[PDB]
């Protein structure tokens, strides 16, 4: 995984500490970036889950 600021991710554990912004997708040979296996598939899941987190009657 590649960060937005030209940085690669060695261990997939810095996700837990904070939210990170990644580089956009492109098909250029010099600068090639591809969508992740789980990219955009948790949209509704994220919406419902954040709705659960925000409400504090629980």
């Amino acid at each position: 995984p590649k960060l937005s600021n030209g940085e690669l991710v060695e261990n997939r554990q810095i996700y837990f500490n904070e939210k990170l912004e990644f580089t956009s997708s492109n098909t250029s040979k010099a600068t090639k970036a591809s969508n992740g296996p789980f990219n955009g598939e948790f949209n509704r899941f994220l919406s419902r889950f954040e709705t659960k987190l925000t409400d504090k009657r629980l």
Partner: protein
């Protein structure tokens, strides 16, 4: 006394619309006079109203 009526194809307006001298204020909330601020919505209803359906959105 408190009563709330969600009547699709409104029919009970006449049943309670007695003459004005009897002093029975009736709150007739029709589609013309209804004031629902859209910004009060939550995630699900906002997505349902705007994102719509019937398409695999990109």
């Amino acid at each position: 006394s408190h009563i709330i009526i969600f009547d699709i194809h409104s029919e009970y307006k006449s049943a309670f619309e007695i003459d004005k001298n009897e002093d029975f204020n009736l709150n007739y909330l029709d589609v013309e006079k209804l004031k629902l601020p859209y910004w009060l919505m939550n995630s699900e209803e906002l997505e349902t109203l705007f994102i719509e359906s019937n398409e695999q959105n990109s």
